[PDB]
């Protein structure tokens, strides 16, 4: 049986790109923070970046401090940084450097897809710098992704820019030099994203009907992209074993959990409890994240769902 | 201000109704519910519920397969659903080859094709097929991108003409876009219903969302607060529920203070699954006549399984 934890991922020394995704509100942000904290703590000599590709950023709300387009350390951590790109501010910067014409952000700052484009550019930057230096980079990038739908668009982007760039070069009739470096860079991203030792996708879900089918669709689609996926976090579990609501909802949860357990026997299925307190701030996030490394035991570790800070 | 959506449900002016909010708060559940209530309340009008969330859940919610072609909800004579598949939609575009498949996966393609659906609808409404369109939107981030398309395209087309049959249709597009821009900014024709839950991570994003919508001159006068435990009314145990309700009620007071002019519609956490027409209909009733925890407390367990 595959162990019900992410210890293997947490202590991995090969993985460079870790996507955390799933349906809306299942716990991507909470889980991506938790994974990032666990990796950073277990690998102090590596530098980690947690980037949000969800345009509605929640990393700042999660940690309770203000992040932005420029990476900043999580306060209290020496090797974990967060990034939340603001498209308009980023395009302003691009306008300035391109000049060194002034209406770029006003024009493109709100085009659908702009968030994925800038997120992807950030991947291209680190891809290049990890090899060529000339600037700051990280050993490992964790992605707190947008819900399913738009994240698939983002993960299709290496293929899409690739297949596209085949044709465009001749149409133009050093502009062609950029194309080659852009093609070469995108190709590199495609190699690494489809390398199971470098890149993996951690799916997050809850034990409810509407999440089950969207989660299965997602995993199937990722596999069709040759994206590695071998880990599933089942979040917000009650473990109610009085109260008519809790026992009724837990009965439901346990029914689908049995189904999840049957289908995904080849996956790390990591079961996380619903906590009474708020999982925010480094302290509470860290305490919650421990159960990604060593599986949660409702009888042994049951009290911790009530031992989260309220400050 | 009455804590329901009755005035929206029985409106005879609203053409475009957006239902949005943070991930997993209950957009799909609420949008299906609103659509049902309007259709039941106005049999004389045809309603379309379009999902602009590229990960569609309307089919999952009703338990039947929807697609790019509008199809009636089984059990409803005047409600239809639409879930556009870009790859499928782009084949028909191309026919009327390799390119269309390329574009099928570009980020923003979902918003584009969804917006075209609005544009096509405008062209039919001006000339001589639904009376009201309800949008089950993607979570906050990408929905703001969609609502900025009228402005975005207008400006795009202004520069496209300057660098430049070809000229003629560019002006037609510019005009159709302006028509959408004015209608979306008309409080009588267009409104945005916000869905949220009484938790910390939801309310900061929700306030961010409403403020941004206001800056777009988009009307927002209704908030659905979903998944409320209410508790106490249960009848007086369960440390989990007791502690979680205390938390919810803390923030519910904050919601009530800030949004005093809004319709604040409080919806209970049901024990059963809100899927299928029957259960969605039973849930949707509390959008019209506000939910009473002391009286209607039984409905929480009455959902069909």
């Amino acid at each position: 049986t595959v162990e019900p934890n992410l210890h293997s991922l947490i202590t991995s020394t090969t993985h460079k790109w870790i996507f955390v995704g799933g349906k809306g509100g299942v716990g991507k942000t909470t889980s991506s923070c938790s994974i990032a904290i666990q990796m950073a703590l277990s690998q102090p000599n590596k530098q980690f970046l947690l980037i949000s590709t969800n345009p509605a950023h929640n990393l700042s709300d999660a940690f309770g401090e203000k992040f932005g387009k420029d990476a900043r350390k999580v306060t209290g951590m020496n090797n974990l940084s967060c990034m939340e790109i603001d498209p308009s501010a980023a395009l302003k910067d691009m306008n300035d450097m391109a000049v060194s014409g002034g209406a770029l952000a006003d024009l493109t700052g709100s085009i659908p897809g702009i968030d994925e484009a800038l997120s992807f550019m950030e991947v291209m930057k680190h891809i290049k710098r990890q090899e060529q230096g000339e600037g700051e980079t990280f050993d490992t990038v964790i992605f707190d992704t947008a819900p399913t739908g738009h994240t698939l668009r983002f993960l299709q982007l290496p293929n899409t820019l690739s297949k596209l760039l085949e044709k465009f070069g001749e149409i133009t009739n050093d502009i062609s030099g950029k194309l080659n470096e852009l093609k070469a860079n995108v190709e590199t991203i495609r190699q690494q994203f489809t390398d199971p030792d470098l890149t993996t996708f951690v799916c997050v879900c809850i034990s409810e009907f509407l999440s089950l089918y969207e989660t299965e669709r997602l995993i199937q689609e990722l596999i069709s992209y040759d994206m590695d996926v071998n880990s599933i976090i089942v979040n917000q579990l009650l473990f109610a074993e009085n109260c008519k609501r809790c026992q009724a909802r837990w009965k439901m949860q346990k029914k689908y959990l049995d189904q999840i357990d049957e289908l995904y026997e080849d996956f790390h299925v990591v079961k996380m409890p619903l906590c009474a307190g708020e999982i925010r701030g480094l302290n509470n996030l860290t305490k919650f994240s421990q159960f990604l490394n060593k599986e949660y035991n409702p009888i042994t570790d049951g009290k911790v769902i009530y031992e989260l800070e309220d400050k | 201000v009455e804590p329901n959506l009755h005035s929206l449900i029985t409106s005879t002016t609203h053409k475009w109704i957006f239902v949005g909010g943070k991930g997993g708060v209950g957009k799909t559940t609420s949008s299906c519910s609103i659509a049902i209530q309007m259709a039941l309340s106005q049999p004389n009008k045809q309603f379309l519920l379009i999902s602009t969330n590229p990960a569609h859940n309307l089919s999952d919610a009703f338990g039947e397969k929807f697609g790019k072609d509008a199809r009636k909800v089984t059990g409803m004579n005047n409600l239809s659903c639409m879930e556009i598949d870009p790859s499928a939609a782009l084949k028909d575009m191309n026919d009327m080859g390799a390119l269309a498949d390329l574009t099928g996966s570009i980020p923003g393609i979902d918003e584009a094709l969804s917006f075209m659906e609005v544009m096509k609808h405008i062209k039919r409404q001006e000339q001589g097929t639904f009376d009201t369109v309800i949008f089950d939107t993607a979570p906050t981030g990408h929905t703001l991108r969609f609502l900025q398309l009228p402005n975005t395209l207008s400006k795009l087309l202004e520069k496209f003409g300057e660098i430049t049959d070809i000229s003629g249709k560019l002006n037609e597009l510019k005009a159709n876009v302006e028509t959408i821009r004015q209608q979306f900014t008309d409080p009588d024709l267009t409104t945005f219903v916000c869905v949220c839950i009484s938790e910390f991570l939801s309310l900061y994003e929700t306030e961010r969302l409403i403020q941004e919508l206001i800056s777009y001159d988009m009307d927002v006068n209704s908030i659905i607060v979903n998944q409320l435990l209410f508790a106490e009314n249960d009848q007086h145990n369960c440390k989990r529920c007791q502690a979680r309700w205390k938390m919810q009620k803390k923030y519910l007071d904050q919601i009530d203070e800030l949004y005093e002019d809004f319709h604040v519609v409080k919806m209970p956490l049901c024990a059963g699954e809100i899927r299928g027409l029957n259960n969605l209909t039973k849930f949707s009733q509390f959008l019209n006549k506000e939910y009473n925890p002391i009286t209607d407390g039984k409905v929480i367990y009455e959902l069909e399984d």
Partner: antibody, heavy 119, light 110 residues
């Protein structure tokens, strides 16, 4: 025990500049709004600037807009007012004060720092 | 531009008296009004928010009311510690600007 403490006040000449600090404790100012309110000698209260880190938003009274910049370091739990192109009428006691995301009334205030602008 | 017109500029009153101070917004601000007390050399203290809600720790002899765009602060029984200057403040949801009234100085009558 929440409190706000201003610092950085002093004497400056017309056209000069000055940075005020508002050190917060007892709460995380990321989740709140911080406001600067000033009071000229013998005059009433005048709001001049606001920052809401949780929403990436700032606002300014027209009287200081384009001259003053409000900011916040959420790693130090401190807010700042960078005051450029100062003039005689900017002479005042400057208070920083706290608001909430759901209530923009000012419940906690610092004891104020004096700014004098004169040639 | 928008205004919070507070009246009167000053008033004289005795201990035990009932005092009322008023503020008129130039346009509707719903109930988003607050009242403050300030003594010389000291920071203002929040008394009332949301036009009529008593802030924590404030004595109950303070109360507030709204009638359209008209807002009123009332001190039911003036105590020696209540002689001070009072300000109204609006914080309308639809605006990011904050506007104070011009202030009302309550002095002791003799």
């Amino acid at each position: 025990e929440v409190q706000l403490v201003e610092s950085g006040g002093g004497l400056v000449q017309p056209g000069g500049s000055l940075r005020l600090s508002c050190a917060a404790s007892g709460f995380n100012l990321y989740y709140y709004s911080i406001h600067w309110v000033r009071q000229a000698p013998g005059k009433g209260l005048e709001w001049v600037a606001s920052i809401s880190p949780y929403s990436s938003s700032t606002s300014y009274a027209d009287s200081v807009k384009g001259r003053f910049t409000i900011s916040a370091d959420t790693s130090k739990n401190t807010a700042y007012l960078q005051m450029n192109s100062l003039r005689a009428e900017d002479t005042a006691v400057y208070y920083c004060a706290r608001g909430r995301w759901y209530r923009r009334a000012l419940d906690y205030w610092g004891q104020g720092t004096l700014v004098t602008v004169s040639s | 531009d928008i205004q919070m017109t507070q009246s009167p500029s000053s008033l004289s009153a005795s201990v035990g008296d009932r005092v009322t101070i008023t503020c008129r917004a130039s346009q509707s601000v719903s109930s988003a009004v607050a009242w403050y007390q300030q003594k010389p050399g000291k920071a203002p203290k929040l008394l009332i928010y949301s036009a009529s809600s008593l802030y924590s720790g404030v004595p109950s002899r303070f109360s507030g009311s709204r009638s359209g765009t008209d807002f009123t602060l009332t001190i039911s029984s003036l105590q020696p510690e209540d002689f001070a200057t009072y300000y109204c403040q609006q914080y309308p949801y639809y605006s990011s600007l904050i506007t104070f009234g011009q202030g009302t100085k309550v002095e002791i009558k003799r």
